Design a protein around this nucleic acid. Structure first.
Ligand code: ZN
Lengths: 67, 25, 213, 136, 101
RNA sequence: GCGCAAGACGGACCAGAGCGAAAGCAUUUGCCAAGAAUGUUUUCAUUAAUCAAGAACGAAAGUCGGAGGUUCGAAGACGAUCAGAUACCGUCGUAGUUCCGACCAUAAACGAUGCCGACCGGCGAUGCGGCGGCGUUAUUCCCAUGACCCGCCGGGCAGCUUCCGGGAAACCAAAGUCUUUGGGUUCCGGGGGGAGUAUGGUUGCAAAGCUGAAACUUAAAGGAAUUUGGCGAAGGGCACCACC
């Protein structure tokens, strides 16, 4: 690896439709706090609302479709 | 057996019959 | 294994004085030891640079080729090697329901430099036009191409390298092409797509020195 | 890496070629000439199984490694030369070009002109495969 | 029976056209029969444009575009779901599919 | 990244556009020869239409003799896949693919629709040639030419629509003017299989091409369309006798 990445935390804003082969995960718009205009879309499973935050180990991947 | 491969098999049989006829003159 | 970039010096590449911006960037080469002289690695090198990085109030869809010839000290004096166009406009000007005219010439300047100019021309659709075809006859295309060849032949035979590459910075050749082909059929996008050289004469130090001011 | 330059007056410009295919990504960095390179890191050097060579994560790791090595050397700005497989095979770039470019953008470098250098031919050479193509 | 008014292609007085190759496959298909798709794309996709403009030295830098032309064999086109089968009454619709964004 | 050498090909422009009897034809320019349509108050006066015998051209593959062989690639050599896999897939690779000279005359050579000629509705368009007209442009005046716009005529590739009409229907402005049955003319089919097979003739270096039966066996083989049907077909929903 030769590098350590700090743990980045970010707040979701809007929940899209549920994706996955078995439909086990949701798709949300994940928005950071280092810049107020930096909002990405990632994949998260479990019950997700609008307002809770997420813990992001790897903060530069976008979302994914059914494949 | 479709028509083209039947034609190819018939051609091979015709070649064998022609060869045995010309060698059995 | 020893670090290979301990023997690398950042040189300076210099545009000729006929351009506005002189400093292009920086390159590097291994030091001299035996069979590898440091000046040889900068002998043949082609720089694909942009036009808006070369000039100030000019467009950004044209590119130029600059070749180094000799180094004096820590400076790489460059020379004209060719003119190209960006691929984005090259596949953005082409559209359906229109035709193309292309001409290529083997013209030589008034000095010992021989060029090869390529040109492309497209179709203008009129403002009050309802027809979507916008095609043309074949003899009109031949006449437009003939106008292109005589314009490109006429305008560079009386001039040298400095004057033709000074004319290459605007589109005056393309403007004269699209103004000559007005009574035949209208053209809306005329540009010089490519410039190539075939004949290279004996190198002269004084001509390159006077090319840099 | 060293010289009489200053880090505040100007910036060092290089040219990076991104070969993206559907099998591997080549995150290459050359000088302004393009003749002599700085470091060449490929997407297969990071992952172990080749199925992850076409993954965007391998291209991000290779781009981050070559970008940290280049900004350790002292090159700050890059000119993009994106290139697909080209020829008669495929005109569409690979899946790792976007991830490699984003990893170069997020590493702290600077980005100049962007252009595509995919070798499109003038209908030259017969393609790989028969008249009926690949059957699957 | 006769499925279409034409023969699934666009030759009326020619008899022969030059062949082209598929993109997903290597199938030799005639030019006027293949389902062309001239897609217009750019370098970055939706959200990397902000990061590119933040890292771009030139202010108000216009982004380039990628122009390729895609030729498909009809089996590889239907398997890629770019064209779908239609009903017998609604087959005779030569209008293009509507674009919105 | 800079150059060299060889062979092949002509992308985007390229369309239900053009030419050609058909097979077919796409880098710029030069030369030779031919042709449709348009224009004509020119020329001859029935020279016309279809066609046994015969004649020209005829994709790719195949054969003989050369030069050349970049890529692709029958046969072959392997690696996986699989119960078997000398198949789909992947890597090499001989003939062949390219050019010349001599052959054969075969295609779903298909618009699966012979050629000539008369009649029989409408509409928007396209390519060519000719005719007429408000306007804009080749910078401001005039005329002719090109470029737009508005219409007409003739030939053609097509398209939309119609309860002309036809058909078993799919459909066709011809596949209409057909029992209210006759415009001229060439070729060609009498249930299916045997069979495009055997012999004979002819042609070809060869492979094969043309001509082409019979005994015997069979009550069906087929064309169009309708309704649940099944799709390892597509588009939307549902179920803890399904899954997460
Ligand atoms: Zn395909």
């Amino acid at each position: 690896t030769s590098r350590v990445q700090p743990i980045k935390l970010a707040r979701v804003t809007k929940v899209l439709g549920r994706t996955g082969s078995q439909g086990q995960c949701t798709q949300v718009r994940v928005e950071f706090m280092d810049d107020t205009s930096r909002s990405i879309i990632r994949n998260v499973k479990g019950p997700v609302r609008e307002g809770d935050v997420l813990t992001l180990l790897e903060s530069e991947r976008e979302a994914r479709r059914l494949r | 057996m479709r028509a083209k491969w039947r034609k190819k098999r018939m051609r091979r049989l015709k070649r064998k019959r022609r060869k045995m006829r010309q060698r059995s003159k | 294994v020893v670090d290979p970039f301990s023997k690398k010096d950042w040189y300076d590449v210099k545009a000729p004085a006929m351009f506005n911006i002189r400093n292009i960037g920086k390159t590097l080469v291994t030091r001299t030891q035996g069979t590898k002289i440091a000046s040889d690695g900068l002998k043949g090198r082609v720089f694909e640079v942009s036009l808006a990085d070369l000039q100030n109030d000019e467009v950004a869809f044209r590119k130029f080729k600059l070749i180094t010839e000799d180094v004096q000290g820590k400076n790489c004096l460059t020379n004209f090697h060719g003119m190209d166009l960006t691929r984005d406009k090259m596949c953005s000007m082409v559209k359906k329901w229109q035709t193309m005219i292309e001409a290529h010439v083997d013209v030589k300047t008034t000095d010992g430099y021989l060029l090869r100019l390529f040109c492309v021309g497209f179709t203008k659709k009129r403002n009050n036009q309802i027809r979507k075809t916008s095609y043309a006859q074949h003899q009109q295309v031949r006449q437009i191409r003939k106008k292109m060849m005589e314009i490109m032949t006429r305008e560079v035979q009386t001039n040298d390298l400095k004057e033709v590459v000074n004319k290459l910075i605007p589109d005056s050749i393309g403007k004269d092409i699209e103004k000559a082909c007005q009574s035949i059929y209208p053209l809306h996008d005329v540009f010089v797509r490519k410039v190539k050289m075939l004949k290279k004469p004996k190198f002269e130090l004084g001509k390159l020195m006077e090319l840099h001011g | 890496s060293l010289g009489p330059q200053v880090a505040e007056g100007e910036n060092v410009f290089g040219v990076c070629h991104i070969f993206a295919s559907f099998n591997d990504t080549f995150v290459h960095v050359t000088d302004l000439s393009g003749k002599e390179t700085i470091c060449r890191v490929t997407g297969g050097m990071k992952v172990k199984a080749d199925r992850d060579e076409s993954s965007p994560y391998a291209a991000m790791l290779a781009a981050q490694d070559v970008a940290q090595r280049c900004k350790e050397l002292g090159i700050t700005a890059l000119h993009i030369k994106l290139r697909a497989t080209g020829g008669n095979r495929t005109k569409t770039p690979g899946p790792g070009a976007q991830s490699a470019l984003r990893a170069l953008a997020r590493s702290g470098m600077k980005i100049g002109r962007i252009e595509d250098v995919t070798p499109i031919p003038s209908d030259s050479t017969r393609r790989k495969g028969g008249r009926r193509g690949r059957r699957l | 029976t006769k499925k279409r008014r034409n023969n699934g292609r666009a030759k009326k007085g020619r008899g022969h056209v030059q062949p082209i190759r598929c993109t997903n496959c290597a199938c030799c298909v005639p030019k006027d029969k293949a389902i062309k798709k001239f897609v217009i794309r750019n370098i970055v996709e939706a959200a990397a444009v902000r990061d590119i403009s933040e890292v771009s030295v030139f202010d108000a830098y216009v982004l380039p575009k990628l122009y390729v032309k895609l030729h498909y064999c009809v089996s590889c086109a239907i398997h890629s779901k770019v064209v779908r089968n239609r009903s017998r009454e609604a087959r005779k619709d030569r209008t293009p599919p509507p674009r919105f964004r």
